[PDB]
């Protein structure tokens, strides 16, 4: 009756959950802006996903409050680089760390 | 005895070391007398003035009791506040401060019990100690992990596993989804499993799991050794094989050894996990001992990246304040005084990085929303039974724990009351995770 | 839980490690259940059988409770006897044995209190540890001192003395007649007095006193350090300058550090004085902690030539048996079981040399006949107040103590009841010693 | 002489070292006198009491003969059983125990011959020595080899091969199917072939064979050197180039050197193959010498992963018991007394890992079913002639040996009498292996 | 087998290594066949030509038997003379030569017994080994002792003496008149007496005796250790404390370790005393083993200043030739062939210095004229019983031995037959030496 675990590559936080839709991404961005963090967009190759430094999409959205623009920038990154893994981050300046970091598209 | 070592009027300097002692005195003895007794025996140890006393500045080199307070709910005990000049201690020696504070005062015969509740480390003395080798944020940057608490597991049984079998437990645990696995406080080098074989097979398993998952993996390899030479050799071998984190028992191993290992870890870029074995012989008795908040301050002064602090959920709702207070002491830069949470002194840490909080012991998928709500992202959750007891295996248990963690983190980020809606959130996550579903079925 | 980890029928092997725990359980819980709980949590830590458990020999790798006894005079507590295979521990690691025994069992929530009363070290495990670097007889041969207890003194105040002033206290103390002086447990290297200057001036004073007296002199130079590197550097400097003995704090400094220092002392021919600072936070509570007899066994396993054991005279006549029992544990080769003296197990030491007994704290010339009668020749008597408080100075106080010691030793050798005739013997000695006479006049 | 050093009533302690000597005395001398003579000359060496004798505990520090037995079939010899306190020897020194036992007693003029048959190592003394660096199970885990005996080969001729030619013999031998190849006991560093070139070319060949086969490969690189510095340098170079196993001559090289090399191997994770060169000058004579079972105990105490024990099949059916007995001594944890197999004492090894048994010398494919049935899976079978003499080459010979080994192992697993059906099993295997078929045709 | 490895016509080169084997073959086997068998198994080990054999110069790289001689008085044995090219061995490796000669040939099943009688070391191979660190003449120059044999003593009992008591035996022995005292082959570092304390107290006693006498003194401090690291540490400590001579057990310790220690002694200017423990298990059997003359050659090749050779007087008058022959082998630069004395080969030593001959075991003042006449001035006479058994003490016994030695030396110098007039010479000396007189009275 027991079932075997099917092994596959994973992508940090939220990778063990089903891929997020627009509503869930918007909720995460709203959380990020509610915590005072600056949303950021990164992309890198699937084989280079483990890189510490991804290609930076434009600049971090300091003081940005519109989740619609954040999601539109995510989609623009996807359109410009369609084979690239895309990650959403949130900068915490006080802690000098990232309060949130997860991939939106897992590459192909 | 009275007028000499207790000054009600004395205002303590910002560089003074302050200690709070819960004195349960013998009935009939004077409160101020007992306070001066703790102050004297912790600083000078005598009252009879000898000819060598007159060669020194007696007004300076002495500990003084400056305030006595009633203990709420305990008429048989009182709080004694004692100020110590910073000159009385070796700079950067938690060993020396600890010895000066607790060497002989607990053997005082005129008190029924003595508890060291809180100790104020001034920023001047704080700036001298090395502190945590890396800290929470630097460890997060090194491990490339953000936005969620870390997951750990203690490999069980504590006895019997060969190097390869222990490695083949660690490998499934890591490949299942846990960020870390944990060597037990008992496992340093036993006849059934030698330390070098441990390190080699553990590194092999960690590398295999990291390659097969795509996430940075680690194992707290225990370097607690009979000798500092052996401990340094084991840590150097761990670095040579590439282990990113090691573990030490800072109480049984010793504060001197822990400080040396922390300095070595800061020098060599190796993360340090700290286990709090034996802490119960010291901090459990309510009327005699030294508090775990003081032990936490001592540990973060000595150096360490992780520290066991308790599961918090393991206590009743009305007994969580002291645990939360020492959690704040371990993690935060400045902790204001809070009598309800047991913080007796304002504790300024300056730039010293925080230490990850480790929750371990009898916790599984059901406690998890409460664990997330209480600890926040800057914590490590350990699942020994909650991972090894999974009917489908270590990998399935780790996957269940990871899925539950990610679901709870996302629910908290969405603004939901994760403790109020924990069952609904976990069920919704289990609709996509059979391993998680069977995990709740097992541990309901 | 019951049938699995407690076997009434089990007969413990001569190589098994045996531990006796005084369990003060929560009312209503089963005695055998609590005994198995201590046995399990000190050996394996769990009852739920996981799939990794079946990969090992569960019948072998576990601690078992084989006997439960009532505590005389305490109906709320019982004695649990647990046997541990020698295979469960690293060979020659007091750190590992101590961790395995006391890591988590004291945090057990189903018992109100847990005390580790006695631990049986089998000769097989004893033969692996280095033990005391020199031992009583080898130290006596090296120092050329026979037929009398050794005399020591703690230099006070603990604070304020410069290197030269501390040396000019040590010099008068040694030239007065004491065989040794003692660095305090607080003094390792403070801003007012650095360790190198301590070692240099102390060696100068010791050499001057030895030259002016004609007797071998020593000072327990404290090498307790924040780091093992610093400790080894200080010990090496002491050897380089020629100091015959050093001192370590084996509890606050750590068991690993103490074992390493003891091995270094055995290698380099340097005597090791051991101070028992903090021991009270552990061994004072009658219902929770680890006994000082167990701490004494651990210390003599780790290594040390001297050890503080208490003044014995400081307790009432009806409370001296446990102190005498751990004195015998420290000094004698084989200590038979003695429930009256608190010796729960037959303890065979083989060829491991004994450790000098140190009596210190509030003792002067009047306690001395009792001290001699109780301790015998193989002990060190420390006179901090009884030497520094002498109105004529440290040298006069030391001369008084030495004259009293020699008179008491000769009186014991003549067959007199020194405790019954102590006042007469001391007065007869004072008829030839004005310093001794004024010493009794001061401390009467 | 008689009453002083032999006690019929003495019951030997569990920590006592027991030795059994086959004494072939001069006709007319007393059996008890000769037993006391061996006991005295092996412990104290004299009977005349000198003034320095009275300074010691003569009753303790002496070896005593407690039992005399007749030798079955030899009326001219008798068995002397002698007990030695554990205090008489350095802890963890096979060199010191061996010297104390055999320094002078074999030169005794009142006996025609003296043989040391068996020696009892108590668990207390066993726990002190390091023992085998890895052991059978740890070596199996490291090499990823299970369920069959290991295969080895000695590269021949012993003389003339350059580094590259020796490597091009080793490469074909390994790629043919043997798990290991073996450096000869003569080859450490000769003018025709230097040791560094040996190590480099051997490592190249081993890596190439491992890559081309898919199985872990090794070569017992000889590190026996004129000096311990040279031996340590060669072992360090082997580790640096990545050789998984080295070889030492533990008798000609020396017990001290072998113990040091074994400790280094345990420290550095390098397997140790032990060759028993010269053993025949010692263990061959039936009336004078030290038995190979005692040599095997000494070797496993010193440290080693492999050991030559003989081919067993090389003796008649009625002369195999002693070889099997010392095989059990080398491999098993506890060997009960067995007079038929030559085991005179119960030998408890505790947790010390076993040592692989090596069978070498004049054995080929035909002896193989008997070799498997006798040795079991925990053995190494060496085929020097049986591999190099193959008409199709080293690779074909190794393939033949491997196919025969796998067929015999499967036949044993199926429950067949492999010795009774050896020819049928080998022929059935040869129906699928032309190399094996031509191997039997060559060696029939 | 016959034509291949034995050449009657072969004339051995001056650089060839020659070995003489006494073969006691199984009845019926051919003498030339057995000779070729020893030659082959000691050089190549096989007869079956494999394909790797054809890659080498088989005519060169092989040992050949060139002469077979009858054994006088033994019709069941014959002498086999075998020549070995110098290319077959590592340069300067007694270990490699010894292994090549005796690795497997003694296990040959076609011979009942095999004895290695003599081995010829060519000057070319001799010039490569370091040889004795100092030699007889250099040691005499360093110790400022000429014209008489040296006197030594073994400190007894072998067991029980503490460091100070052993030193207080050594001190009286040296101050009595002996040039040296001797550590026993059993004493390296025991629980009752550690090696560092041995070295310190022995050096103190030696310095005191030298100061009080006016003659250079020494003690063969035993540095035989379980590990070469420990041996080198002990030797370095002996040099640091100033000990002029140390002792090693070159058979039990090992030839590699002995060669390394001899090289260290030559480098550091420390004299080396060599004890021959275990030699009896090897050289006693007349039909199987390796001769003590071969062992003496091996020892002097490895390095050593002293060597035990036997007391010579301990054998009958008709059995002294072999002992004298190996004495000449040890001491003289060129020893011609002498079948009566057992010298089978001309042995050219070139410039390698001789080694002092040590006579020890059951010898006292009465044997002394014979000892002087037999050994000459270049020998060391050891008096364990003859010094410690003196009724007036060690100093008196040493004085008696020294007076007897000086009297015998002067009598020999005057041209008297010291063996014929020994009693008269000793009595005349005793007329001026009461200690000597009572010594003869005790040992008559």
D125 Cβ under 8 Å from any chain E Cβ: no
Are A28 and B410 in contact (CB < 8 Å)? Answer: yes
Q: List, as own/partner pairs, every contact residues B232-241 make where C-beta atoms lie below 8 angstroms and the sequence separation is at least 24, other chains included.
A: B232/B260, B232/B261, B232/B264, B232/C228, B234/B188, B234/B195, B234/B199, B235/B261, B235/B264, B235/B265, B235/B268, B235/B270, B237/B196, B237/B199, B238/B199, B238/B270, B239/B268, B239/B270, B241/B199, B241/B200, B241/B203
Give E192's contacts in chain C (Cβ within 8 Å).
351
Are E225 and D156 in contact (CB < 8 Å)? Answer: no
Chains that touch E (3 or more CB pairs under 8 A): C, D
Longest dimension (CA), chain A: 53
Cα(E366)–Cα(E361) distance, rounded to whole angstroms? Answer: 13
Are B213 and A24 in contact (CB < 8 Å)? Answer: no
Residue E70 burial by CB count (10 A; 0-12/13-18/19+): exposed, middle or buried? exposed
CA-closest candidate to residue C89, choices D270, D314, D350, D36: D350
On whether the CB atoms of residues B192 and C61 are closer than 8 A, the answer is yes
Are B407 and A17 in contact (CB < 8 Å)? Answer: yes
Give B259's contacts in chain C (Cβ within 8 Å).
226-227
Cα(D262)–Cα(D232) distance, rounded to whole angstroms? Answer: 11
The domain defined by E136-443 carries CATH number 3.20.20.110: yes
- Interface C–D counts its CB contacts (< 8 A) at 33
**Residue with the two structure tokens 């995460």:** A28
Residue C306 burial by CB count (10 A; 0-12/13-18/19+): exposed, middle or buried? buried
Written as six digits, the tokens of C419 are 């405790």
Q: Which of C138, C266, C352 sits opposite E163 (nearest CB)?
A: C138
Are D228 and E224 in contact (CB < 8 Å)? Answer: no
CA-closest candidate to residue B121, choices B294, B379, B336: B294
Are C127 and D127 in contact (CB < 8 Å)? Answer: yes
Q: Strand, coil or helix: what is D13?
A: coil
Q: Which of C141, C267, C351 sits opposite E163 (nearest CB)?
A: C141
How many domains does chain A contain in total? 1
On whether the CB atoms of residues E105 and E44 are closer than 8 A, the answer is no
Cα(D358)–Cα(B225) distance, rounded to whole angstroms? Answer: 36
Written as six digits, the tokens of C269 are 């021919």
Breaks (C-N over 2.5 A) in chain A follow: none
Range of the domain at A105: 1-108
With touching defined as 3 or more inter-chain CB pairs under 8 Å, the answer for chains D and B is: yes
C114 min Cα distance to partner chain B (Å): 8
Are D138 and B197 in contact (CB < 8 Å)? Answer: yes
E163 Cβ under 8 Å from any chain C Cβ: yes
Give E102's contacts in chain D (Cβ within 8 Å).
252, 277-278, 281
B213 Cβ under 8 Å from any chain A Cβ: yes
Q: Quick one: three-class SS letters along C118-152?
A: EEECCHHHHCCCCCCCCCHHHHHHHHCCCCCCEEE
B51 Cβ under 8 Å from any chain C Cβ: yes
Cα(C185)–Cα(B105) distance, rounded to whole angstroms? Answer: 13
Cα(C437)–Cα(D265) distance, rounded to whole angstroms? Answer: 67
On whether the CB atoms of residues B68 and B10 are closer than 8 A, the answer is no
Handedness of CA C150, C155, C156, C158 (dihedral sign): negative
Written as six digits, the tokens of A96 are 């000098």
Breaks (C-N over 2.5 A) in chain C follow: none
CA-closest candidate to residue E390, choices E377, E403, E378: E403
DSSP sequence for D222-283: E---SSHHHHHHHHHHHHHHT-SEEEEETTTS-HHHHHHHHHHHHHHT-EEEEE-TTHHHHH
C286 Cβ under 8 Å from any chain B Cβ: no
Cα(E268)–Cα(E142) distance, rounded to whole angstroms? Answer: 13
Q: E64-71 and C218-222: which strand pairing?
A: unpaired
Q: Quick one: three-class SS letters along C241-290?
A: HCCCEEEEECCCCCHHHHHHHHHHHHHHCCEEEEECCCHHHHHCCCCCEE
Contacts of C55 (CB under 8 A, 6+ apart): B160, B161, B165
Q: How remote is the C-alpha of E220 from its chain's centroid?
A: 15
Are E50 and D158 in contact (CB < 8 Å)? Answer: no
Cα(A98)–Cα(A85) distance, rounded to whole angstroms? Answer: 18
Angle of CA points D185, D187, D192, to nearest 5°? 160
Which residues of E are known to be catalytic? 156, 275
**In degrees to the nearest 10, what's the CA dihedral of D248, D251, D252, D254?**
80
Cα(B384)–Cα(B367) distance, rounded to whole angstroms? Answer: 14
Cα(E96)–Cα(D189) distance, rounded to whole angstroms? Answer: 9
Strand partners, D247: D222, D273
Secondary-structure breakdown of chain D: helix, strand, coil percentages, each rounded to the nearest 5: 45, 20, 40
Among chain B residues, the shortest Cα distance to A26 is held by B414
CB < 8 Å from C in window 211-270 of D: none
Are B212 and A102 in contact (CB < 8 Å)? Answer: no
Strand partners, C67: C81
Angle of CA points E348, E312, E274, to nearest 5°? 60
C56 min Cα distance to partner chain B (Å): 5
On whether the CB atoms of residues D132 and D352 are closer than 8 A, the answer is yes
On whether the CB atoms of residues D41 and D110 are closer than 8 A, the answer is no
Letter string b/e over residues C363-387, b meaning 16 or more CB atoms within 10 A of that residue's CB: bbbbbbbbbbbbbeebbbbbbbbbb
Q: Is the peptide bond before D157 cis (omega within 30 degrees of 0)?
A: yes
CA-closest candidate to residue C140, choices C380, C420, C301: C380
Beta strand segments in C183-222, E: 218-222
Cα(B260)–Cα(C62) distance, rounded to whole angstroms? Answer: 34
DSSP sequence for B170-195: HHHHHHHT-SEEE--TT-SSBTTB-H
Among chain E residues, the shortest Cα distance to D58 is held by E160
Give B394's Cβ-side CA count (13 Å radius).
Answer: 25
Q: Strand, coil or helix: what is D119?
A: strand
E94 min Cα distance to partner chain D (Å): 7
Letter string b/e over residues D58-84, b meaning 16 or more CB atoms within 10 A of that residue's CB: beebbbbbbbbeeeeeeeebbbbbbbb
Q: Which of B56, B104, B165 sits opposite C157 (nearest CB)?
A: B56
Q: List, as own/partner pairs, every contact residues D380-383 make where C-beta atoms lie below 8 angstroms and the sequence separation is at least 24, other chains included.
A: D380/D149, D380/D150, D380/D151, D380/D152, D380/D179, D380/D180, D380/D306, D380/D356, D381/D149, D381/D150, D381/D151, D381/D152, D381/D405, D382/D151, D382/D152, D382/D153, D382/D154, D382/D182, D382/D358, D383/D151, D383/D152, D383/D153, D383/D178
CA-closest candidate to residue D268, choices B241, B353, E118, B269: B241
Residue C352 to residues C270, C332, D123, D432, E262: CA-CA distances in angstroms? 17, 9, 17, 66, 35
Contacts of C81 (CB under 8 A, 6+ apart): C18, C19, C20, C65, C66, C67, C68, C69, C344
B134 min Cα distance to partner chain A (Å): 14
- Does D323 belong to an annotated binding site? no
On whether the CB atoms of residues E125 and E86 are closer than 8 A, the answer is yes
Cα(B369)–Cα(B408) distance, rounded to whole angstroms? Answer: 6
Are C87 and B189 in contact (CB < 8 Å)? Answer: no
Contacts of A53 (CB under 8 A, 6+ apart): none
D269 min Cα distance to partner chain B (Å): 7
On whether the CB atoms of residues D365 and D443 are closer than 8 A, the answer is yes
Residue E414 burial by CB count (10 A; 0-12/13-18/19+): exposed, middle or buried? exposed
CA-closest candidate to residue E334, choices E120, E115, E129, E130: E120
Beta strand segments in C153-227, E: 180-182, 218-222
Give B231's contacts in chain C (Cβ within 8 Å).
256
Are E162 and C138 in contact (CB < 8 Å)? Answer: yes
Give B58's contacts in chain C (Cβ within 8 Å).
157, 160
Cα(D345)–Cα(D322) distance, rounded to whole angstroms? Answer: 14
On whether the CB atoms of residues C55 and B165 are closer than 8 A, the answer is yes
Chains that touch A (3 or more CB pairs under 8 A): B
Neighbours of D100 (CB within 10 A): 29
Which listed residue (D62, D134, D273, D275) is catalytic? D275
Handedness of CA B131, B134, B135, B137 (dihedral sign): positive
Are C388 and B50 in contact (CB < 8 Å)? Answer: yes
Which listed residue (C156, C239, C263, C288) is catalytic? C156
Contacts of B266 (CB under 8 A, 6+ apart): B130, B133, B134, B303
Cα(D64)–Cα(B224) distance, rounded to whole angstroms? Answer: 44
Cα(A80)–Cα(A42) distance, rounded to whole angstroms? Answer: 12
Q: Which of B144, B147, B215 sits opposite A10 (nearest CB)?
A: B215
Residue E404 burial by CB count (10 A; 0-12/13-18/19+): exposed, middle or buried? buried
Q: Which of B53, B186, B257 sits opposite C254 (nearest CB)?
A: B257
Cα(C149)–Cα(C163) distance, rounded to whole angstroms? Answer: 29
Cα(E386)–Cα(E396) distance, rounded to whole angstroms? Answer: 11
Give D280's contacts in chain E (Cβ within 8 Å).
104, 106-107
Give D25's Cβ-side CA count (13 Å radius).
Answer: 20
CA-closest candidate to residue B76, choices B34, B23, B115: B23
Residue B334 burial by CB count (10 A; 0-12/13-18/19+): exposed, middle or buried? exposed
Q: How remote is the C-alpha of D125 from its chain's centroid?
A: 20
Chains that touch D (3 or more CB pairs under 8 A): B, C, E
Q: Strand, coil or helix: what is B6?
A: strand
Among chain D residues, the shortest Cα distance to C91 is held by D127
D56 Cβ under 8 Å from any chain E Cβ: yes
- Helices C255-268 and B255-268 cross at an angle (nearest 10°) of 90
Are D128 and C125 in contact (CB < 8 Å)? Answer: no
On whether the CB atoms of residues E258 and E250 are closer than 8 A, the answer is yes
């Amino acid at each position: 009756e027991m079932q075997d675990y099917k092994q596959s590559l994973k992508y940090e936080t939220f990778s063990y959950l089903p891929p997020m839709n627009a509503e869930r991404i918007r909720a995460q961005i709203k959380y990020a802006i509610a915590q005072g963090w600056s949303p950021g967009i990164e992309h890198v190759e699937v084989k280079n996903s483990m890189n510490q430094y991804w290609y930076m999409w434009k600049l971090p959205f300091f003081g940005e409050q519109n989740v619609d623009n954040v999601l539109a920038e995510i989609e623009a990154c996807r359109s410009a680089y369609p084979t690239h893994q895309v990650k959403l981050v949130a900068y915490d300046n006080y802690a000098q760390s990232l309060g949130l970091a997860f991939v939106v598209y897992r590459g192909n | 005895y009275r007028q000499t070592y207790w000054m009600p009027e004395y205002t303590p300097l910002d560089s003074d070391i302050l200690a709070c002692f819960k004195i349960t005195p013998q009935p009939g003895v004077d409160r101020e007398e007992a306070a001066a007794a703790v102050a004297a025996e912790s600083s000078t140890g005598t009252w009879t003035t000898v000819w060598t006393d007159l060669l020194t500045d007696m007004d300076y080199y002495k500990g003084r009791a400056y305030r006595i307070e009633d203990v709420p709910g305990d008429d048989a005990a009182f709080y004694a506040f004692i100020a110590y000049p910073i000159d009385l201690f070796e700079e950067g020696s938690v060993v020396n401060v600890f010895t000066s504070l607790v060497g002989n005062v607990f053997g005082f015969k005129a008190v029924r019990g003595l508890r060291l509740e809180d100790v104020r480390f001034p920023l001047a003395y704080v700036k001298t100690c090395g502190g945590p080798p890396h800290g929470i944020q630097v460890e997060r940057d090194k491990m490339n992990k953000y936005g969620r608490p870390l997951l750990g597991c203690t490999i069980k049984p504590k006895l019997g596993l060969s190097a390869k079998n222990y490695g083949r437990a660690v490998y499934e645990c890591l490949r299942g989804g846990l960020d870390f696995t944990k060597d037990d406080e008992n496992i340093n080098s036993q006849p059934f499993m030698r330390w070098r074989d441990r390190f080699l097979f553990v590194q092999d398993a960690t590398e295999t799991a990291e390659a097969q998952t795509g996430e940075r993996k680690g194992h707290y390899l225990n370097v607690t050794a009979p000798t500092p030479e052996e401990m340094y050799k084991r840590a150097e071998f761990a670095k040579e094989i590439g282990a990113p984190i090691i573990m030490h028992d800072y109480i049984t191993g010793g504060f001197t050894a822990n400080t040396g290992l922390a300095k070595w870890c800061q020098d060599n870029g190796v993360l340090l996990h700290i286990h709090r074995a034996m802490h119960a012989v010291i901090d459990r008795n309510p009327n005699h001992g030294i508090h775990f908040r003081v032990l936490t301050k001592i540990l973060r002064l000595s150096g360490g990246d992780h520290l066991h602090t308790g599961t918090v959920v393991g206590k009743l709702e009305g007994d969580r304040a002291s645990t939360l207070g020492w959690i704040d002491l371990l993690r935060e830069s400045f902790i204001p005084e809070d009598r309800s949470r047991g913080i007796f002194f304002d504790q300024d840490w300056g730039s010293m990085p925080g230490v990850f909080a480790v929750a371990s012991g009898g916790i599984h998928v059901w406690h998890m929303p409460a664990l997330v709500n209480i600890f926040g992202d800057d914590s490590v959750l350990q699942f020994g039974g909650g991972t090894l007891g999974h009917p489908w295996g270590n990998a399935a248990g780790a996957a269940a724990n990871r899925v539950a963690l990610e679901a709870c983190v996302e629910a908290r980020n969405q603004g939901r009351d994760i403790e109020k809606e924990g069952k609904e959130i976990l069920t919704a996550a289990a609709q996509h995770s059979p391993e998680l579903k069977i995990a709740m079925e097992t541990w309901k």
